Design a protein around this nucleic acid. Sequence first.
RNA 1: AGAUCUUGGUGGUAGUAGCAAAUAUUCAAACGAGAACUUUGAAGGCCGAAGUGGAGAAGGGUUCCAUGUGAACAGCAGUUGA
Lengths: 153, 50, 31, 107, 63
Amino acid sequence: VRYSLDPENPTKSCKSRGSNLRVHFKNTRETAQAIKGMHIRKATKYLKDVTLQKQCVPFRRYNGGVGRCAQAKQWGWTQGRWPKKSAEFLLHMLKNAESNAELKGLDVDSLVIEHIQVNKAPKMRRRTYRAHGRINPYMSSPCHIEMILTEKE
Amino acid sequence: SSHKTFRIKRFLAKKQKQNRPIPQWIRMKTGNKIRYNSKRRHWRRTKLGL
Amino acid sequence: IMNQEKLAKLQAQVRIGGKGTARRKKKVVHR
Amino acid sequence: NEVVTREYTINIHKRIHGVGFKKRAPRALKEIRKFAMKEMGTPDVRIDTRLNKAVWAKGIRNVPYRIRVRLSRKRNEDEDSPNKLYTLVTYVPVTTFKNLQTVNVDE
Amino acid sequence: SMLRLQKRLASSVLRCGKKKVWLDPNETNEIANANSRQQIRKLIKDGLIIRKPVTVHSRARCR
RNA sequence: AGAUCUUGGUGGUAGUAGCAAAUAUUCAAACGAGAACUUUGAAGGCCGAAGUGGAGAAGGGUUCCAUGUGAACAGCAGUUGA
Ligand SMILES: [Mg+2]
Ligand SMILES: [Mg+2]
Ligand SMILES: [Mg+2]
Ligand SMILES: [Mg+2]
Ligand SMILES: [Mg+2]
Ligand SMILES: [Mg+2]
Ligand SMILES: [Mg+2]
Ligand SMILES: [Mg+2]
Ligand SMILES: [Mg+2]
Ligand SMILES: [Mg+2]
Ligand SMILES: [Mg+2]
């Protein structure tokens, strides 16, 4: 399939993809921006820490109403959160990408997340009921995710 | 209700019989253009005519 | 027959609740 | 050692002071679990049903002020688990809490 | 695994409410294998299903 | 380019308002990849016979029962479900 940002050498690189994933696009985009450029081990332990609420992801663009935390000072930011579902989805994608690296036969102790991209998926419709006999949308915001890992040390 | 007439019971019987999914082998026919039974009815979503 | 090992564990199975609940009468397996 | 068992007394009154009526017994269970974690260094803490009954003995809001418990650190080496140690907290009925120290108890 | 059917059948056979039906928490698989009222009766005979006594409402204070 | 134009699609608002009527949950275990919500047991409570109990009429029409699944739905979840 066509990824954006094809790797500079598709022999030291492995790919992972997911479509129509039932996680919030904004939280997932912030988490992907947080883990972008990380070594794979660092990213894995960081996502586990996000799940355990020991490290936060900084909410930089989609930060409307997002509260302040002390762990956001690690980044140059003030607003951060701990999206558990986004962290788990990215952890599953990282495991899949590491398995792909194993299949391609390149050691997984030198992989760095060079490309990660979160795109909006087709929204799914649900229904909510309002005061005066009115109906309002209750849309979900799923996301496609893709990532390219590359060997470097 | 529990008390019902024979004609009402027969009407409901036909509705029950025709409220079912399409067979799987329909989609393999030449030039089907049918994906699913679009006339499916749920007892709670939409109510019968009577 | 009952010995000390059998008695000390029997006390457990007959108690199926706290104070004020009926004791278990039997647990018999038969095929 | 690491299969040690000790007898403590916990000031439930102190750890529950200020908690609303419908939360006092659940918070007492949470504080007992936190106390066990802090004392024995084990995230895996099991609470005996007799201990739970002892905490809930006087209803949801009139929790006992002090409670005498026994923390036993035991091997979890029964399956593939992240933790190889766990703490079982049992209930020790006492008649008075005066002059009760934290005591190492043998097997 | 899930013993809702067994609790309902035990209540019907024992002619009591589901409050008073006691299923053995250790013999969960054996009780789960019971899918008929005959098997419920056999479990009642064997002692895996017990009718709990009526909660005490004493009248000594009233007397 | 306009017609509070017609139909369709998409933003900011915004991860915001909100998921606050009727006292209340807790412990252990089982199944399970996964348990705040399923099941079992123990405990603490509520309805308190003008009931949150047991049965009917009208209305519904298969929702009843067993087994299986975990796509969508059950405005969190679910191993559960009308
Ligand atoms: Mg705002
Ligand atoms: Mg509404
Ligand atoms: Mg209306
Ligand atoms: Mg209706
Ligand atoms: Mg135009
Ligand atoms: Mg809010
Ligand atoms: Mg609210
Ligand atoms: Mg009352
Ligand atoms: Mg009634
Ligand atoms: Mg049913
Ligand atoms: Mg839901």
